[PDB]
Design a binder for this molecule. Structure first.
Ligand SMILES: [Mg+2]
Ligand SMILES: [Mg+2]
Ligand SMILES: [Mg+2]
Ligand SMILES: [Mg+2]
Ligand SMILES: [Mg+2]
Ligand SMILES: [Mg+2]
Ligand SMILES: [Mg+2]
Ligand SMILES: [Mg+2]
Ligand SMILES: [Mg+2]
Ligand SMILES: [Mg+2]
Ligand SMILES: [Mg+2]
Ligand SMILES: [Mg+2]
Ligand SMILES: [Mg+2]
Ligand SMILES: [Mg+2]
Ligand SMILES: [Mg+2]
Ligand SMILES: [Mg+2]
Ligand SMILES: [Mg+2]
Ligand SMILES: [Mg+2]
Ligand SMILES: [Mg+2]
Ligand SMILES: [Mg+2]
Ligand SMILES: [Mg+2]
Ligand SMILES: [Mg+2]
Ligand SMILES: [Mg+2]
Ligand SMILES: [Mg+2]
Ligand SMILES: [Mg+2]
Ligand SMILES: [Mg+2]
Ligand SMILES: [Mg+2]
Ligand SMILES: [Mg+2]
Ligand SMILES: [Mg+2]
Ligand SMILES: [Mg+2]
Ligand SMILES: [Mg+2]
Ligand SMILES: [Mg+2]
Ligand SMILES: [Mg+2]
Ligand SMILES: [Mg+2]
Ligand SMILES: [Mg+2]
Ligand SMILES: [Mg+2]
Ligand SMILES: [Mg+2]
Ligand SMILES: [Mg+2]
Ligand SMILES: [Mg+2]
Ligand SMILES: [Mg+2]
Ligand SMILES: [Mg+2]
Ligand SMILES: [Mg+2]
Ligand SMILES: [Mg+2]
Ligand SMILES: [Mg+2]
Ligand SMILES: [Mg+2]
Ligand SMILES: [Mg+2]
Ligand SMILES: [Mg+2]
Ligand SMILES: [Mg+2]
Ligand SMILES: [Mg+2]
Ligand SMILES: [Mg+2]
Ligand SMILES: [Mg+2]
Ligand SMILES: [Mg+2]
Ligand SMILES: [Mg+2]
Ligand SMILES: [Mg+2]
Ligand SMILES: [Mg+2]
Ligand SMILES: [Mg+2]
Ligand SMILES: [Mg+2]
Ligand SMILES: [Mg+2]
Ligand SMILES: [Mg+2]
Ligand SMILES: [Mg+2]
Ligand SMILES: [Mg+2]
Ligand SMILES: [Mg+2]
Ligand SMILES: [Mg+2]
Ligand SMILES: [Mg+2]
Ligand SMILES: [Mg+2]
Ligand SMILES: [Mg+2]
Ligand SMILES: [Mg+2]
Ligand SMILES: [Mg+2]
Ligand SMILES: [Mg+2]
Ligand SMILES: [Mg+2]
Ligand SMILES: [Mg+2]
Ligand SMILES: [Mg+2]
Ligand SMILES: [Mg+2]
Ligand SMILES: [Mg+2]
Ligand SMILES: [Mg+2]
Ligand SMILES: [Mg+2]
Ligand SMILES: [Mg+2]
Ligand SMILES: [Mg+2]
Ligand SMILES: [Mg+2]
Ligand SMILES: [Mg+2]
Ligand SMILES: [Mg+2]
Ligand SMILES: [Mg+2]
Ligand SMILES: [Mg+2]
Ligand SMILES: [Mg+2]
Ligand SMILES: [Mg+2]
Ligand SMILES: [Mg+2]
Ligand SMILES: [Mg+2]
Ligand SMILES: [Mg+2]
Ligand SMILES: [Mg+2]
Ligand SMILES: [Mg+2]
Ligand SMILES: [Mg+2]
Ligand SMILES: [Mg+2]
Ligand SMILES: [Mg+2]
Ligand SMILES: [Mg+2]
Ligand SMILES: [Mg+2]
Ligand SMILES: [Mg+2]
Ligand SMILES: [Mg+2]
Ligand SMILES: [Mg+2]
Ligand SMILES: [Mg+2]
Ligand SMILES: [Mg+2]
Ligand SMILES: [Mg+2]
Ligand SMILES: [Mg+2]
Ligand SMILES: [Mg+2]
Ligand SMILES: [Mg+2]
Ligand SMILES: [Mg+2]
Ligand SMILES: [Mg+2]
Ligand SMILES: [Mg+2]
Ligand SMILES: [Mg+2]
Ligand SMILES: [Mg+2]
Ligand SMILES: [Mg+2]
Ligand SMILES: [Mg+2]
Ligand SMILES: [Mg+2]
Ligand SMILES: [Mg+2]
Ligand SMILES: [Mg+2]
Ligand SMILES: [Mg+2]
Ligand SMILES: [Mg+2]
Ligand SMILES: [Mg+2]
Ligand SMILES: [Mg+2]
Ligand SMILES: [Mg+2]
Ligand SMILES: [Mg+2]
Ligand SMILES: [Mg+2]
Ligand SMILES: [Mg+2]
Ligand SMILES: [Mg+2]
Ligand SMILES: [Mg+2]
Ligand SMILES: [Mg+2]
Ligand SMILES: [Mg+2]
Ligand SMILES: [Mg+2]
Ligand SMILES: [Mg+2]
Ligand SMILES: [Mg+2]
Ligand SMILES: [Mg+2]
Ligand SMILES: [Mg+2]
Ligand SMILES: [Mg+2]
Ligand SMILES: [Mg+2]
Ligand SMILES: [Mg+2]
Ligand SMILES: [Mg+2]
Ligand SMILES: [Mg+2]
Ligand SMILES: [Mg+2]
Ligand SMILES: [Mg+2]
Ligand SMILES: [Mg+2]
Ligand SMILES: [Mg+2]
Ligand SMILES: [Mg+2]
Ligand SMILES: [Mg+2]
Ligand SMILES: [Mg+2]
Ligand SMILES: [Mg+2]
Ligand SMILES: [Mg+2]
Ligand SMILES: [Mg+2]
Ligand SMILES: [Mg+2]
Ligand SMILES: [Mg+2]
Ligand SMILES: [Mg+2]
Ligand SMILES: [Mg+2]
Ligand SMILES: [Mg+2]
Ligand SMILES: [Mg+2]
Ligand SMILES: [Mg+2]
Ligand SMILES: [Mg+2]
Ligand SMILES: [Mg+2]
Ligand SMILES: [Mg+2]
Ligand SMILES: [Mg+2]
Ligand SMILES: [Mg+2]
Ligand SMILES: [Mg+2]
Ligand SMILES: [Mg+2]
Ligand SMILES: [Mg+2]
Ligand SMILES: [Mg+2]
Ligand SMILES: [Mg+2]
Ligand SMILES: [Mg+2]
Ligand SMILES: [Mg+2]
Ligand SMILES: [Mg+2]
Ligand SMILES: [Mg+2]
Ligand SMILES: [Mg+2]
Ligand SMILES: [Mg+2]
Ligand SMILES: [Mg+2]
Ligand SMILES: [Mg+2]
Ligand SMILES: [Mg+2]
Ligand SMILES: [Mg+2]
Ligand SMILES: [Mg+2]
Ligand SMILES: [Mg+2]
Ligand SMILES: [Mg+2]
Ligand SMILES: [Mg+2]
Ligand SMILES: [Mg+2]
Ligand SMILES: [Mg+2]
Ligand SMILES: [Mg+2]
Ligand SMILES: [Mg+2]
Ligand SMILES: [Mg+2]
Ligand SMILES: [Mg+2]
Ligand SMILES: [Mg+2]
Ligand SMILES: [Mg+2]
Ligand SMILES: [Mg+2]
Ligand SMILES: [Mg+2]
Ligand SMILES: [Mg+2]
Ligand SMILES: [Mg+2]
Ligand SMILES: [Mg+2]
Ligand SMILES: [Mg+2]
Ligand SMILES: [Mg+2]
Ligand SMILES: [Mg+2]
Ligand SMILES: [Mg+2]
Ligand SMILES: [Mg+2]
Ligand SMILES: [Mg+2]
Ligand SMILES: [Mg+2]
Ligand SMILES: [Mg+2]
Ligand SMILES: [Mg+2]
Ligand SMILES: [Mg+2]
Ligand SMILES: [Mg+2]
Ligand SMILES: [Mg+2]
Ligand SMILES: [Mg+2]
Ligand SMILES: [Mg+2]
Ligand SMILES: [Mg+2]
Ligand SMILES: [Mg+2]
Ligand SMILES: [Mg+2]
Ligand SMILES: [Mg+2]
Ligand SMILES: [Mg+2]
Ligand SMILES: [Mg+2]
Ligand SMILES: [Mg+2]
Ligand SMILES: [Mg+2]
Ligand SMILES: [Mg+2]
Ligand SMILES: [Zn+2]
Lengths: 97, 107, 95, 70
RNA sequence: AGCCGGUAGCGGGCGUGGAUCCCUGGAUGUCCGAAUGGGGGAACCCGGCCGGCGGGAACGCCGGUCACCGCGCGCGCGGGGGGAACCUGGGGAACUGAAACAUCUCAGUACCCAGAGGAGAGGAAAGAGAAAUCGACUCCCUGAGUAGCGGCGAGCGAAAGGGGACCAGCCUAAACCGUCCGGCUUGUCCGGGCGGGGUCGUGGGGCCCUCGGACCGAAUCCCCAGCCUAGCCGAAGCUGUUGGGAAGCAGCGCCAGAGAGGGUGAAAGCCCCGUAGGCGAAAGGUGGGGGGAUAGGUGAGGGUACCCGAGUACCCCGUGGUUCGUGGAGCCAUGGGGGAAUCUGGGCGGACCACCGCCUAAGGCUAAGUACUCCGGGUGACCGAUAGCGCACCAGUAC
RNA sequence: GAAUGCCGGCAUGAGUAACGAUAAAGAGGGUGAGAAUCCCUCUCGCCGUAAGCCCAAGGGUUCCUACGCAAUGGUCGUCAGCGUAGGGUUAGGCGGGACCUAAGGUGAAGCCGAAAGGCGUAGCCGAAGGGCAGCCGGUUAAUAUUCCGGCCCUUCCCGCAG
RNA sequence: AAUCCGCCUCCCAACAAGCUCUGCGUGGUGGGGAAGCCCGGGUGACAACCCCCCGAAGCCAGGGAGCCAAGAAAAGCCUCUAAGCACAACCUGCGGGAACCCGUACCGCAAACCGACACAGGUGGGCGGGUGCAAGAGCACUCAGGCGCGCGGGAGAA
């Protein structure tokens, strides 16, 4: 319910538009709007836990960009990350974005 | 920045206006913040003084009341005439007041 | 720079302060932030005595007025220093 | 004090070392307290001497600060 | 040539050996405050470490230093908070209007929040849209209350084009080359960094052949005019008379690139301050103008088909933006799902298809013309103390 | 000329209601320009689980002394919590801090949220709770467990001995 | 980790004593000291300072019993040991030295606090004497102490 660490996708505001009536294309009088109210659309955030240089790293990422985490782990083979903290490993992965 | 004073203590001025118009006299004091000069023996007033240490017997003393600086006119020590004031740069070159009629210095 | 003469401002001139001279208790106006330990050093440095006791008290300024204008005198601090047996502060013996 | 005396004070002060300047400040702050004590018992008619001494002390501290900024 | 603020007095001092005062730079600058050693009920309190003071070890004082976060190899750089209005982004009402009311309106307004700076945004076409055309963006006029949108109600309301202001265009990613570093799955590897190369729509670039060998020039830096932060010079009138006072009246003059205006005892071109016209910076600030550097910029064929920005385009679902309220609904944006290709690729011209054209998405920057008025100045068929700012006065005070 | 308009001024009601507990006063002497109202004396009355004394809040010089009476005081005023000025508040042991923790607050780690922010074990802050060493008397116009006197005590530092 | 604490076993001690701590009394010593009378002070006075009774809700206290609704924390303190260190360090006695910051006036059931007022209202804790009334903090009077309430003088109708 927040922000994708890979894409930056975040909650957006969208209207909820309740409608009545038969559309004109079906031969009806037309659609009438019986209510418009704000709501939020959330990114499909999920957890992704990966091992990187012997350390466990967790990403909060939209389902759309789950493979983008694994690509980062691949490209992390050309880095020197041994002995680093997970917080420090995570910053190094995201720098490759 | 500073009050402009065409006259100073203590050159000799003609009093050209007011009840003492025509009097020539020396400038005892200049009060820039009032734009006023005191001229010897001009503009005399009768001030009451209380019986006191400074004035035993009390009664009245005589004060010189200030004159508005514009009422007064320097008298040129060279040609002895009342004059407007010009400015002249010497060779230093400091600047001095000079008589508008002739050209003598007023200092 | 901080010297003994920035800590000790003036003698306290009153019948209560004078009554203390006979015992070697001398009363000064001191800087309001000045500590008991530093008044001791300041008095010893300035008056060539040995302070064995220091009492202090704040003296709040009096509110005062000149017509329309209500104000306050500045706050002050008093110090009573006890000199070693036999010693004197001749500058205050004055009287 | 007089203008000539001030120039003279600054010239002499600018030839003293920091240690000598501190000892002079310390002595002038001593004399300043003396003036305070005298003023406080109504025995200092020449009260201008207080202001002059406070500004002497300020000039000395100014010179002492000159010599230690380099 | 006077001076020690408003502010006189007491009591004392200073200044042509140049004071007071005005401008610039510097020094000092308790405590609180982003407040940052720690704590705290802001302006108080309590510490560590190094050095100093005291007879000084206990105690205290003085100087230095010590928060947290980000980035960069414990070190360094940066951040924090404030600013009248203006600006952009993230959120975002209602009264009211529709003579009731729900879609609609008010309005993406008020307001909250984040951020920017002297501006901000935008910006160098995956544009427009019909001109066989135009050529970044911004801003003004106009197009136009048009086109359209709309319980087709109340109402809402474009763009192109034309006229103007200003004017300017650049840097990358990828192909390919080089080098350093490290992974294990050992090399024609893969990855990460840096350098070279490369930047486009008459498509451009790479690589391989082939011929051919100085002008440009910054938005960066240096210098300098110019300007700002104090200032200065500046023409020409006397007499009489009434009057407390002349500048009024009278006589006789004079100046004017100056007869704007304000003072002076009343009504003054010539008494004072000024005005016209000129002059002026050692120091700090500015410098868009002038000059100089540096950065950077630069060929033609032919072949090769290597590269040309991905969870992107694209389609579907849910919405927003636009004049567009589901409409025949495209375009631009994107929360969910599915999901390409590298020019014979792709997006657009209002469903869709064909034809004919326009453009080159998924990286970034970019002056000027525009907005505002805390501040300074100039000017009012603006107010003149119940007016004009809430405040002409010690007011965001008293209360 | 009217808006129970706005601001200010000034009337009427009117020398009227009232002068704030029905605990209560009288006289003599003094001071003074002035005295029912200030000071002093005597008599009278009222409170006395208070209407007396101590402490904590809160208030912030109202305390003490001198001088004064325009206003403040429901009258008067020579008086005063009022005007002007000078003086007055003294701690190793009392209270708080250089100690502890409570609710709660804050908050390394960590969690969450369009922004602002919301949580959060430890830790920290937080008292009228825990803890901690001073009693009696004298002195000032005004402070006193603080000054002084007598007799006691606590912590820290350094040293000696065991 | 522990020699401490907890648990098991044995010995002895136990409603004792012992060790320890507090209260009260005494205690070298230092103070105080009435009425009355003279002008807050002097005198009283070389003041005396003793006996008996009553007696707390306070103290010894972390006392005892009963009951159910089952009644903070942490530091000071003591003990255990770890790194370390064991010429140190800690404990005990003594001696010398050192001991900071803030509050302290005054009002405080009220004329100084909250109520626009010197307002019959509101304001938490402690002391609150004596006699009598069965008791009491009730009631009457009264001590110490504090007051007569900041308009009065007459009159004697509704
Ligand atoms: Mg929105
Ligand atoms: Mg919906
Ligand atoms: Mg339809
Ligand atoms: Mg149809
Ligand atoms: Mg519809
Ligand atoms: Mg989840
Ligand atoms: Mg998973
Ligand atoms: Mg998706
Ligand atoms: Mg997917
Ligand atoms: Mg001049
Ligand atoms: Mg005249
Ligand atoms: Mg004449
Ligand atoms: Mg000069
Ligand atoms: Mg200093
Ligand atoms: Mg005395
Ligand atoms: Mg000291
Ligand atoms: Mg104290
Ligand atoms: Mg204090
Ligand atoms: Mg003051
Ligand atoms: Mg000077
Ligand atoms: Mg001396
Ligand atoms: Mg002054
Ligand atoms: Mg003088
Ligand atoms: Mg000069
Ligand atoms: Mg300056
Ligand atoms: Mg600070
Ligand atoms: Mg701080
Ligand atoms: Mg803090
Ligand atoms: Mg040190
Ligand atoms: Mg000493
Ligand atoms: Mg030391
Ligand atoms: Mg320090
Ligand atoms: Mg911020
Ligand atoms: Mg902020
Ligand atoms: Mg800022
Ligand atoms: Mg917005
Ligand atoms: Mg809302
Ligand atoms: Mg509505
Ligand atoms: Mg409207
Ligand atoms: Mg309206
Ligand atoms: Mg309407
Ligand atoms: Mg309506
Ligand atoms: Mg209507
Ligand atoms: Mg209605
Ligand atoms: Mg709208
Ligand atoms: Mg907005
Ligand atoms: Mg607005
Ligand atoms: Mg935001
Ligand atoms: Mg900001
Ligand atoms: Mg601009
Ligand atoms: Mg910009
Ligand atoms: Mg931009
Ligand atoms: Mg481009
Ligand atoms: Mg037309
Ligand atoms: Mg609209
Ligand atoms: Mg045009
Ligand atoms: Mg223009
Ligand atoms: Mg152009
Ligand atoms: Mg290698
Ligand atoms: Mg690679
Ligand atoms: Mg490689
Ligand atoms: Mg490489
Ligand atoms: Mg090509
Ligand atoms: Mg450039
Ligand atoms: Mg001139
Ligand atoms: Mg002229
Ligand atoms: Mg005449
Ligand atoms: Mg004339
Ligand atoms: Mg004429
Ligand atoms: Mg003109
Ligand atoms: Mg004029
Ligand atoms: Mg005029
Ligand atoms: Mg005229
Ligand atoms: Mg006229
Ligand atoms: Mg004129
Ligand atoms: Mg000009
Ligand atoms: Mg000019
Ligand atoms: Mg090229
Ligand atoms: Mg070619
Ligand atoms: Mg290819
Ligand atoms: Mg592209
Ligand atoms: Mg990408
Ligand atoms: Mg869609
Ligand atoms: Mg819409
Ligand atoms: Mg839509
Ligand atoms: Mg339609
Ligand atoms: Mg549409
Ligand atoms: Mg094509
Ligand atoms: Mg295609
Ligand atoms: Mg498209
Ligand atoms: Mg499309
Ligand atoms: Mg299309
Ligand atoms: Mg198109
Ligand atoms: Mg079409
Ligand atoms: Mg085609
Ligand atoms: Mg196009
Ligand atoms: Mg430009
Ligand atoms: Mg700009
Ligand atoms: Mg611009
Ligand atoms: Mg403007
Ligand atoms: Mg202005
Ligand atoms: Mg006017
Ligand atoms: Mg007025
Ligand atoms: Mg006004
Ligand atoms: Mg008027
Ligand atoms: Mg103003
Ligand atoms: Mg005021
Ligand atoms: Mg009418
Ligand atoms: Mg009426
Ligand atoms: Mg009325
Ligand atoms: Mg009526
Ligand atoms: Mg009215
Ligand atoms: Mg009217
Ligand atoms: Mg009115
Ligand atoms: Mg009225
Ligand atoms: Mg009346
Ligand atoms: Mg009336
Ligand atoms: Mg009557
Ligand atoms: Mg009457
Ligand atoms: Mg009547
Ligand atoms: Mg009546
Ligand atoms: Mg009444
Ligand atoms: Mg009556
Ligand atoms: Mg009444
Ligand atoms: Mg009464
Ligand atoms: Mg009497
Ligand atoms: Mg009498
Ligand atoms: Mg009276
Ligand atoms: Mg009287
Ligand atoms: Mg009475
Ligand atoms: Mg009396
Ligand atoms: Mg009783
Ligand atoms: Mg008050
Ligand atoms: Mg007062
Ligand atoms: Mg008192
Ligand atoms: Mg008083
Ligand atoms: Mg008196
Ligand atoms: Mg009075
Ligand atoms: Mg009176
Ligand atoms: Mg009177
Ligand atoms: Mg008076
Ligand atoms: Mg009154
Ligand atoms: Mg009265
Ligand atoms: Mg009253
Ligand atoms: Mg009198
Ligand atoms: Mg009073
Ligand atoms: Mg009193
Ligand atoms: Mg008073
Ligand atoms: Mg006194
Ligand atoms: Mg003591
Ligand atoms: Mg304490
Ligand atoms: Mg300490
Ligand atoms: Mg603490
Ligand atoms: Mg704590
Ligand atoms: Mg955190
Ligand atoms: Mg919190
Ligand atoms: Mg907590
Ligand atoms: Mg602590
Ligand atoms: Mg605490
Ligand atoms: Mg406590
Ligand atoms: Mg306690
Ligand atoms: Mg204590
Ligand atoms: Mg004791
Ligand atoms: Mg007292
Ligand atoms: Mg006292
Ligand atoms: Mg004592
Ligand atoms: Mg030993
Ligand atoms: Mg174990
Ligand atoms: Mg064992
Ligand atoms: Mg005892
Ligand atoms: Mg005993
Ligand atoms: Mg005795
Ligand atoms: Mg006695
Ligand atoms: Mg007596
Ligand atoms: Mg007696
Ligand atoms: Mg006898
Ligand atoms: Mg008994
Ligand atoms: Mg009981
Ligand atoms: Mg028990
Ligand atoms: Mg039960
Ligand atoms: Mg706890
Ligand atoms: Mg603790
Ligand atoms: Mg070991
Ligand atoms: Mg032992
Ligand atoms: Mg000791
Ligand atoms: Mg301290
Ligand atoms: Mg208090
Ligand atoms: Mg006290
Ligand atoms: Mg007291
Ligand atoms: Mg008292
Ligand atoms: Mg009272
Ligand atoms: Mg009392
Ligand atoms: Mg009551
Ligand atoms: Mg009470
Ligand atoms: Mg009372
Ligand atoms: Mg009162
Ligand atoms: Mg009251
Ligand atoms: Mg009363
Ligand atoms: Mg009351
Ligand atoms: Mg009560
Ligand atoms: Mg009693
Ligand atoms: Mg009986
Ligand atoms: Mg009884
Ligand atoms: Mg009874
Ligand atoms: Mg009874
Ligand atoms: Mg009783
Ligand atoms: Mg009863
Ligand atoms: Mg009773
Ligand atoms: Mg009795
Ligand atoms: Mg009595
Ligand atoms: Mg009464
Ligand atoms: Mg009464
Ligand atoms: Mg009658
Ligand atoms: Zn001449």
């Amino acid at each position: 319910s927040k922000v994708c660490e890979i894409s930056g996708k975040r909650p957006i505001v969208a209207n909820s538009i309740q409608r009545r009536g038969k559309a004109k294309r079906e031969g009806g009088v037309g659609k009438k709007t019986t209510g418009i109210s704000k709501r939020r659309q959330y990114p499909n955030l999920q957890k992704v836990r990966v091992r990187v240089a012997g350390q466990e790293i967790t990403f909060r990422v939209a389902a759309s960009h789950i493979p983008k985490v694994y690509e980062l782990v691949e490209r992390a083979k050309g880095l020197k990350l041994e002995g680093l903290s997970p917080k420090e490993i995570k910053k190094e992965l995201l720098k490759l974005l | 920045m500073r009050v402009k004073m065409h006259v100073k203590k203590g050159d000799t001025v003609l009093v050209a206006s007011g009840k003492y118009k025509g009097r020539v006299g020396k400038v005892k004091e200049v009060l820039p913040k009032k734009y006023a000069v005191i001229v010897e023996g001009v503009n005399i007033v009768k001030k009451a003084v209380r019986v006191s240490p400074k004035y035993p017997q009390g009664g009245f003393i005589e004060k010189e009341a200030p004159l508005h600086a514009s009422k007064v006119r320097p008298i040129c020590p060279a040609c002895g005439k009342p004059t407007r004031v010009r400015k002249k740069f010497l060779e230093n070159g400091k600047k001095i007041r000079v008589c508008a009629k002739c050209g003598g210095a007023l200092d | 720079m901080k010297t003994a003469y920035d800590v000790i401002l003036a003698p306290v001139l009153s019948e209560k302060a004078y009554a203390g001279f006979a015992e070697g208790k001398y009363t000064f106006w001191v800087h309001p932030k000045a500590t008991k330990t530093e008044i001791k050093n300041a008095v010893e440095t300035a008056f060539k005595v040995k302070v064995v006791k220091v009492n202090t008290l704040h003296v709040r300024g009096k509110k005062k007025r000149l017509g329309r204008y209500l104000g306050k005198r500045p706050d002050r601090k008093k110090a009573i220093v006890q000199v070693a047996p036999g010693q004197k502060i001749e500058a205050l013996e004055g009287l | 004090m007089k203008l000539s005396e001030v120039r003279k004070q600054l010239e002499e002060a600018r030839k003293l070392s920091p240690v000598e300047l501190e000892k002079l400040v310390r002595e002038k702050k001593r004399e300043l307290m003396e003036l305070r004590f005298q003023a406080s018992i109504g025995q200092l008619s020449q009260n201008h001497k207080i202001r002059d001494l406070k500004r002497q002390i300020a000039r000395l501290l100014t010179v002492l600060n000159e010599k230690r900024r380099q």
